[PDB]
């Protein structure tokens, strides 16, 4: 077609250059770094608690 | 050039004879220069013999048969943009805010084919809202059409305003309050009030864009107001990617406007008067609202059921399109609950076990069950006495009444209006609020200490000060 000729020419002579990396970034937040919340809270730390608990706990009903 | 002479003006139905081989096409827009301004006519037929039959969108009075008309070439193209934010624009796409020519970016035809089946969003999403009542029992959804039912001016307008405030937090989007068949008196109030609650700042940020469509406007132009508003929304959705929310006024008056246009077009009326093209016309309006890849419109509609007959075709067609219904009630508002929303009456299809997850669902179901049993129980419990409550029964009565006060939370927009600081509580925190109340962790706290409060965490503090 006259179209076929037109297209071929058009396509060749008009090349879209790919979008900037920043614009891609704008629509997609990049990477995810290691979660790293590190150490969580201490678990039942020291026998200080234990001494308190041994003494406190005696409250057992019949 | 493309010109034609007016060859009839029977009613607002103007037949225009155009010179041969230059003829319009169906749904094109013709403009008659007038000392009244312009008359925009929309071609709805070809009568042959180089004549068409068009309908008018402006008053046809004083027209002289033989005025030259000029053809726009296609459906009315209204300016759209970020400039349209906070501008009152009439249906013929011209500023009626009297802040002068809106700085047009692009303009777009009012008729715009609904998004492709391929580009449909394959699964639903939940549009977050601040309102806890909404967020539990009828959670808003992206894309969806959620049709408000209830009172009017009872805070109805304010409920809509609340949503605008929330929308700014929720996304930061825009809105378009489209009013079809809007009393010009009511419109004045809406504009001044909307300015006052700052959702419109004429000197600044405006989320809501206003399109006001008075009842005095021709029935055809009343019909086209809706399509115009939708076009504004599509610029937001498609071309700003935004999720936006478009309010419509009476969709009864949408139907009413349409029925008339059919009758004017001389078509045989379909059952209960409504247009024979009732289904298709509504279909176009409510399928141009959806979640596309780009964005999603979401539409809040007002359904003014005629004769309160849900059997009536105009409601029936609406109910087919609707996904959820929010049922504001004045009885509930009279219980002092603001939200006005009657929780049991509201029903949603966006509240589903899969959709909101099992936990949210289970919490909701329990909250429904507690309230449902409570209301029925309270009927004869009130008569019989609270002493005729079992331990199980008074547990529910207690739990329910704690929920009942807890449901109410002030609105940011109505911070001024009630006087009480607004509460906008995030969706995650809403689930949390009800979970705790279900586990009755803080249920032992006064009813007034749960009255008009935010989330559970918030009301732990308020409970201490209120009690003290």
């Amino acid at each position: 077609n006259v179209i076929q000729d037109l297209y071929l020419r058009e396509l060749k002579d008009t090349k879209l250059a790919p979008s900037t990396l920043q614009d891609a970034e704008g629509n997609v937040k990049p990477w995810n770094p290691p979660q790293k919340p590190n150490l969580p809270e201490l678990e039942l730390q020291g026998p200080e608690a234990l001494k308190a608990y041994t003494e406190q706990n005696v409250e057992t009903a019949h | 050039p493309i010109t034609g002479k007016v060859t009839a003006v029977i009613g607002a139905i103007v037949d225009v004879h155009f010179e041969q081989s230059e003829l319009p096409a169906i749904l094109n827009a013709l403009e008659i220069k007038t000392p009244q301004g312009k008359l925009v006519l929309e071609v709805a037929q070809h009568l042959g013999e180089n004549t068409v039959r068009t309908i008018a969108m402006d008053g046809t009075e004083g027209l002289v048969r033989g005025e030259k008309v000029l053809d726009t070439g296609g459906p009315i193209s209204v300016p759209v943009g970020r400039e349209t934010l906070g501008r009152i624009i009439n249906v013929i796409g011209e500023p009626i805010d009297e802040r002068g020519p809106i700085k047009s970016k692009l303009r777009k035809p009012i008729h715009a084919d609904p998004p492709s089946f391929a580009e449909q969003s394959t699964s639903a999403e939940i549009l977050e809202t601040g309102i806890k009542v909404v967020d539990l029992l009828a959670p808003y959804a992206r894309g969806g059409k959620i049709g408000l039912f209830g009172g009017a001016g009872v805070g109805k307008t304010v409920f809509i305003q609340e949503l605008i405030n929330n929308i700014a937090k929720a996304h930061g989007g825009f809105s378009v309050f489209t009013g079809v068949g809007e009393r010009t008196r009511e419109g004045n109030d809406l504009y001044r009030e909307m300015k006052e609650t700052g959702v419109i700042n004429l000197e600044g940020e405006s989320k809501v864009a206003l399109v006001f469509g008075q009842m005095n406007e021709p029935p055809g132009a009343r019909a086209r107001v809706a399509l115009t508003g939708l076009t504004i929304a599509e610029y937001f959705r498609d071309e700003e990617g935004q999720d936006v929310l478009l309010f419509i006024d009476n969709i009864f008056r949408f139907t009413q406007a349409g029925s008339e246009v059919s009758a004017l077009l001389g078509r045989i009326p379909s059952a209960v008067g409504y247009q024979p093209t009732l289904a298709t016309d509504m279909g176009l309006l409510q399928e141009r609202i959806t979640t596309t890849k780009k964005g999603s419109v979401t539409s809040v509609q007002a359904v003014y059921v005629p004769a309160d007959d849900l059997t009536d075709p105009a409601p029936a067609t609406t109910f087919a399109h609707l996904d959820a219904t929010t049922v504001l009630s004045r009885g509930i508002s009279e219980l002092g609950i603001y939200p006005a929303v009657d929780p049991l009456d509201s029903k949603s299809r966006l509240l589903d076990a899969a959709v909101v997850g099992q936990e949210h669902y289970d919490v909701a179901s329990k909250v429904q069950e507690t309230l449902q049993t409570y209301k029925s129980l309270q009927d004869i419990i009130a008569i019989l006495g609270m002493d005729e409550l079992s331990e199980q029964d008074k547990l529910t009565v207690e739990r329910a009444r704690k929920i009942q006060r807890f449901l109410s939370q002030p609105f940011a927009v109505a911070e001024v209006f009630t006087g009480i600081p607004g509460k906008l509580v995030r969706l995650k925190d809403t689930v949390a609020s009800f979970k705790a109340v279900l586990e009755g962790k803080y249920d032992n706290i006064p009813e007034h200490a749960f009255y008009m409060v935010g989330g559970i965490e918030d009301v732990v503090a308020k409970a201490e000060k209120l009690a003290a």
Binding site: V2, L6, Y7, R9, E10, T14, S19 | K293
Partner: protein, 50 residues
Amino acid sequence: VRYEASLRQLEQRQLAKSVISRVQSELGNPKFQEKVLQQSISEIEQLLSK
């Protein structure tokens, strides 16, 4: 992946309007004359094929 698919669509519509632009350019030319001649002889061939 979403932005990639979106970019293919964006590319397609940009390149679509470039075709339209080239169409508007060709029909101005005396290709408007010469391809009408092509149609004329083609119509001769077609009409002879009946």
